[PDB]
Design a binder for this molecule. Structure first.
Ligand code: TRP
Ligand code: TRP
Ligand code: TRP
Ligand code: TRP
Ligand code: TYR
Ligand code: TYR
Ligand code: TYR
Ligand code: TYR
Ligand code: TYR
Ligand code: TYR
Ligand code: CL
Ligand code: CL
Ligand code: CL
Ligand code: CL
Ligand code: MN
Ligand code: MN
Ligand code: MN
Ligand code: MN
Lengths: 460, 457, 460, 457
């Protein structure tokens, strides 16, 4: 008579090493922004369960991504990151997951051709369950909705309480999703020829299909050249999609830390919640736990940069989070907004470039670009977004640095949460399918089209 | 504490699949947990939305490869905990069963001299049958974690349908991890073989086997020397399987996919392949007929009690389309009866012209009780059963198609015998099974060698 | 004191089988057009030497080409054949051979992309040493120069005598060339990336490089997409170039016949002078030895067709030379001329199509297109040639048949034996490098450019 | 009759290469044919235009791979007629030597457990040295077809520089054919192995070897079972080699190519690799210094007479840049002296820190004369020499790097011993060598097995 079902929880594995634990305990002491307010005794319970479950990724996989990213940081691959703004447990379904990966790969092929160079594919998925808040109380006068990792989307005070059981529901969800994403991509869903076939079907039918035919045709034909050529095609059957989410909830993040075998190398501390995680704009304080936390772990990390960023602060990131000068170890993600990315960005890049360190310069053109529409709904303009990428490019091309890649919020559903692009979404259209639990994201059409427009940036 | 999941508030079956499934599930169903329909239904509703543990493309893939084994051109290895447990469903235990299975796969690959299709008893082996309802302690029998708990107490043994969603939850996570594991370094042939070599050094019967182990090293080195030591060797495909025991479970994880033949059909996406057990195989039973509706390759355990004609009905029902490898028939007779009992069954089935995989479950036939109190197996008897399994087949020119064994990566002491000479006295030291005794790491591996030799003769 | 050097000649291998010899003896009895007039006793000597030397090709190689061609006849690959009009012993040098293969592969990549489908590469080489004659006496009043297989190019009566030692010099030459062609292509010379690099260098510098840049750029990028994609590239390191020549001198051709192992299949009679050979316009008489000869051997054969051809005669070819309906066993090569290919061709194709048999429809746009220039020199216009291909296409596209490929005369040298194309060769230019011993051929530039123009035909 | 070739009526060497080559060729040159300069020059002029038998890209390729053998990570096999002949330069003889060499390559590949670089004495082994000018019959000695004819008559033995261009002519044709052969079916591992199996059935000592032959089949089957039985196995690279005996020949086939290091250098494109012989190795001789100007990997035969210090000079001259595998040093001592003589030579050379390939020429040391009149070898002695060749190397931890043998595909009877027990009486039946006696098909193969075992210990 309560419409839900309580799943009961459980034999601890051996603790991490006293030496690393001291280094870790020392790190976590620093003030943590945006953490949830739930009781410590309870968190510790749930963390204890997390520390003994199977991890959503593994060290071999991540060191392997560190190498690929390395190659991006070196300007020889390009990085594509994308998926839901916020992942909601109710919607972590096979169809939704198929569609977001389908989307990511559809751009992947378009960006791959355009970039003329391998693309590294990272999904926002299997862990993007917590967000930062601005406001203590939301408009409905309720405690902020902080991501299903922390609380329910429903506007009922019960729903909103920070509930750390949610840490585990997070975990089961991310697993499930992860393990689908793997099956999907190891099976035919990331075939090049199929993913492309979806792309053709897009051109047949987008309003702006003209805009795209020419390039879509080159792609077909350069693909067909591959079989003309007889190059062994198995590598065309399967695509690697890594998993990323913002590391916000340190209890979950801390919970999922593990030591590597050490067989490949001396044992390191990694975060197995995900493959790479970033630190947001609100949690990035230099002297804070989040930056500290990113310091300890080996995963590739990223840090978001918005307008307040000062090249000197940039640098300090670089010296904190990339002390060893491992290229691609750290990514920095411009999110100025289109109007300011040209002015704001250049200095940063140069100050950072001067350092030594090679970092991925990745453009997030979504978080700088959000505005409320006359009709109620939070929104983003396709043009302003495109545009920021164009600016991001222009900044790097001018400075002779590498435009590492893009970070975007998209989905496979035909949502109407972003205005414009070939479908010409109108503020009224927005009511029809605003099914995002947070930031408005590029619909499957807007994502593709965006990747066409970015492909054309990459060939200039 | 506990975690709370919501009940949703979903594509219609083609009229025929609905009828056939329903007809299917109306028949009598043995060994089903006794929990309420409301609550079972509820659990089902959750599950009918979770992401599947496997996906169709893979099962078809597995089919193509089982056809290979069927036709005599590949060998099947199926191996795992006898009953996985939620408590033990950890990175180490998973990692080590995956390794134990892989290590036998390489020895087996080299002895077959054909590919071994590798199927783990993992990601859903949470449900057992029981023949006596009331346990030895007078407590209700443990049916495995998807139904109830081991802890020997009234409360714990009550059937908890919360276990269905919990079981799936542990299913995904192991699956996720096995996929992650087999596609990163854990399955590098070379890396796996090195593990085997360690075994030959430190085994007590290293010598016995070192020779064959050297011939594999030489095999494997040979590949490099021919400049073919490439991508294929860095990865292996491990398929998830379990007995399709709980119909509220399998029914929930069903999913409807299109067929390249172009009619839609139902796969059970709780595992790549599932098998009906000895106790659930009634021909007009819910399980057999369920097994007739799902696309998945199925297997059927076969008892000593089995008769050629029944086996044929099994074949004409599970395999009404004569697709090779749709149907495995797993013999378990014990070493003492396998020679007498199996052939006629082989001939009549063979006479039909369907090609099934004949697979040998050595473990299940051969169970016995210690005088120290523990349910156990003798390594010697297990080997003998696979032994005469082979002789039966050679003698008819039929294909000994693969083996089904219960093993673990842990150095357990649940089986007597092997190089170790595990003893009834010894069993009391690490006997961590939730259920049937497993070959530990040394014993599976050992049995792998001994089987490959059976393979070379 | 004679400026030459006589190389002495030699132990017979076992004869071919009495049964096949009877079939063969019976076949050769038919009148042979255009054979040389040299003494039979001598021919027999030289044939005896040929029958025991190592063959320039092997059966495995040829059955393997029969399959590829099959695929062309089925409209799924495209056939490219080209090299010298006439090969002269003096010029069968490593540089000249490099350049003609370099040329053939340069078009090969361009046609491959354009065709969107594998191209089968056959060189006119390692055996194109004999030609047919029109005229008993040439203008200089001398016995016709018939190819170095038969006599010397020099205008001295001594040179012109039909000398059957020349059969062997042919053989040594063809070997030498063949074995270079193999080494070259198994080594880096048929790398895709290198061959393409030559192509880029062509665009940088042809006058008509604009015309070509766009497509050249697609090619680069679709190539770069291959490495972006990570497809195993060894297949991109090496190209198979088969050898073809016209089978004119039956003594040489007969001399080189061998029986296969039979291990793959029942033993067949093949011609190991070459991989595939064609029968010319003058030697193709139906009741003649040349057609008979092509009947006996398993090699893929072709027959040239010019304006006099009547679809019924076409058919009889088809029923004679492809009795078993093996697709791609027989190729028929239109050489109407541009003005007539549109009118002349259609009926033939349809009459032949109606038969059952699948034959490669290959366009020779060179032999229909030759005219003498005001300045003395035999010549061909780039446009008329292009044009014939365009017509050949148009004929097939209209009939919904497959345009199998092209047969062309080209070289790697920057000769000026053909007028026009991007360099705008003028009749006066022609004196500068008319180094062809026969028909004027496309210079390395005209060949490429031709392949650009044909690539554009294939994408319509 | 005869065929007449014209004399032409061609890129200048960089001043240094011209000087160095000239300086090179001015030194004294032993064992050179005695024909006139005009005529030799003429022949040269022809040749300086013929297409080369090999090309640079390949020789560099061969170098990279010889470095592998040098470093201990690959094994070198070099095998052919002792002197090819124009008369025998036919599709069958070629096809069968290529096969005989390949068949040893597979047994050897599997025993080394590393790649065998396979180098044929083919496409130019037309020139021999002679120690006595006047032959046993009082006729001028036969120096091989590139110089003169076998036919035992005055006329035939006169040095005919027409032979230079004829020799190239036969060179190309064999080369063309070996390339054609090795890239079409003749070199399929599988196809080759099947040939080996036939050998084990019908050999008289099949048994002796059947075991090892089964372990290769199993090796080779293993590749398929791991799904790696791909393109690489359908082809093998056979490199042409011969002794660089005739300087009018090698000098003519020289060609100048660019170096990726970017300086131009001269390769001899008459073969992939060439070796100086025992009689032509004078340190200040034309051959050694020629061998110092060409880019090609070179090898140097080494006599019993050899001293550690000379061997070092050889290394410091042929290998002045310390590139591994630029230089092979081929021991031939006979079984009786190899153990005593070779080590010190190994140590001093090793002491230098250049890495050479140490290769064993078993045949040349061990020659002896029948009492039936025929020059012969005992299979037993040949094996023993490779034997102690290995012991020497194991004993120093140096790398036994490969072997150089004279074999043929023909069932000849030119060597005593082997499973066949070829006998002095027997030698008179098929003793078709133009020169040194060859291991026939059975004997090469046999020696391959026996060597691989030397390889497994
Ligand atoms: N695996 C390669 C090729 C590939 C397969 N499918 C794809 C889908 C999109 C982009 C690339 C691919 C990679 O990531 O490219
Ligand atoms: N991938 C092939 C070969 C292989 C890779 N890793 C392995 C691990 C064990 C046995 C075989 C393998 C297979 O699954 O057979
Ligand atoms: N071997 C393939 C690819 C290739 C390599 N080099 C080439 C040169 C031109 C055209 C194609 C190729 C083929 O014939 O294509
Ligand atoms: N191509 C590899 C493997 C191989 C192919 N064919 C062979 C013939 C013999 C021995 C080895 C091989 C090699 O040269 O080794
Ligand atoms: N196996 C433990 C921990 C766990 C929790 C959630 C999972 O998804 C997986 C495992 C349990 O079932 O409580
Ligand atoms: N799980 C449903 C069957 C079902 C499966 C897939 C569907 O798309 C629809 C229905 C059952 O138990 O009966
Ligand atoms: N996404 C779902 C369904 C689900 C339930 C349990 C899992 O382990 C995974 C997914 C939820 O939590 O409601
Ligand atoms: N070997 C024979 C036949 C031959 C002729 C010309 C060749 O190119 C090759 C071989 C000879 O030398 O006379
Ligand atoms: N063959 C010439 C040398 C040479 C080689 C190549 C050249 O490009 C020029 C000269 C000689 O005997 O001396
Ligand atoms: N092409 C030349 C050079 C040559 C000579 C002899 C050959 O075997 C091959 C080529 C000629 O005959 O003059
Ligand atoms: Cl805060
Ligand atoms: Cl570009
Ligand atoms: Cl005539
Ligand atoms: Cl197209
Ligand atoms: Mn967002
Ligand atoms: Mn069991
Ligand atoms: Mn012509
Ligand atoms: Mn010799």
């Amino acid at each position: 008579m309560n419409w839900t079902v309580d799943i009961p929880i459980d034999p601890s594995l051996p603790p991490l090493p006293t030496d690393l634990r001291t280094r870790l305990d020392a790190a976590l002491a620093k003030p943590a922004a945006q953490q949830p307010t739930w009781p410590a005794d309870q968190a510790l319970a749930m963390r204890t369960v997390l520390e003994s479950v199977p991890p959503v990724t593994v060290p071999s996989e991540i060191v392997r991504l560190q190498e690929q990213l390395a190659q991006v940081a070196k300007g020889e691959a390009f990085l594509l990151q994308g998926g839901d703004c916020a992942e909601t447990f109710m919607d972590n379904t096979e169809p939704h997951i198929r569609g977001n990966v389908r989307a990511l790969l559809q751009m992947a092929v378009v960006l791959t051709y355009g970039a003329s160079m391998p693309v590294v594919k990272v999904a926002r998925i299997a862990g993007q369950y917590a967000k930062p808040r601005s406001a203590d109380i939301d408009a409905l006068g309720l405690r902020s909705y902080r991501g299903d990792m922390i609380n329910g989307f429903a506007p009922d005070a019960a729903a909103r309480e920070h509930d750390p059981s949610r840490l585990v529901r997070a975990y089961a969800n991310a697993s499930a999703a992860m393990n689908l994403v793997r099956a999907l991509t190891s099976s035919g869903l990331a075939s090049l020829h199929l993913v492309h076939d979806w792309n053709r079907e897009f051109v047949r039918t987008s309003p702006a299909g003209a805009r795209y035919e020419a390039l879509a045709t080159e792609i077909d034909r350069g693909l067909r050249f591959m079989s003309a050529c007889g190059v062994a095609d198995r590598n065309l059957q399967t695509a690697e999609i890594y998993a990323s989410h913002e590391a916000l909830v340190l209890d979950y993040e801390r919970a999922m830390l593990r030591l590597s075998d050490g067989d490949d190398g001396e044992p390191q501390l990694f975060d197995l919640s995900a493959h790479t995680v970033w630190i947001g704009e609100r949690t990035r304080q230099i002297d804070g736990a989040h930056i500290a936390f990113a310091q300890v772990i080996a995963n590739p990390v990223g840090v978001k940069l918005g307008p307040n960023m000062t090249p000197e602060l940039a640098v300090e990131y670089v010296e904190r989070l990339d002390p060893h000068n491992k290229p691609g170890r750290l990514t920095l993600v411009s999110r100025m907004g289109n109007h300011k990315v040209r002015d704001l960005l250049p200095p940063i890049v140069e100050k950072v470039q001067a350092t030594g360190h090679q970092v991925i310069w990745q453009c997030d053109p979504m978080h700088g670009n959000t505005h409320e529409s006359s009709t109620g709904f939070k929104t983003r303009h396709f043009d302003r977004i495109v545009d920021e990428v164009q600016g991001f490019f222009e900044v790097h091309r001018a400075l002779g640095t590498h435009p590492g890649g893009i970070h975007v919020e998209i989905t496979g559903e035909n949502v109407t949460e972003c205005l414009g692009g070939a479908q010409d979404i109108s503020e009224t259209d927005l009511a029809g399918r605003y099914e995002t639990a947070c930031d408005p994201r590029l619909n499957t059409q807007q994502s593709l089209e965006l990747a066409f427009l970015v492909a054309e940036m990459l060939r200039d």
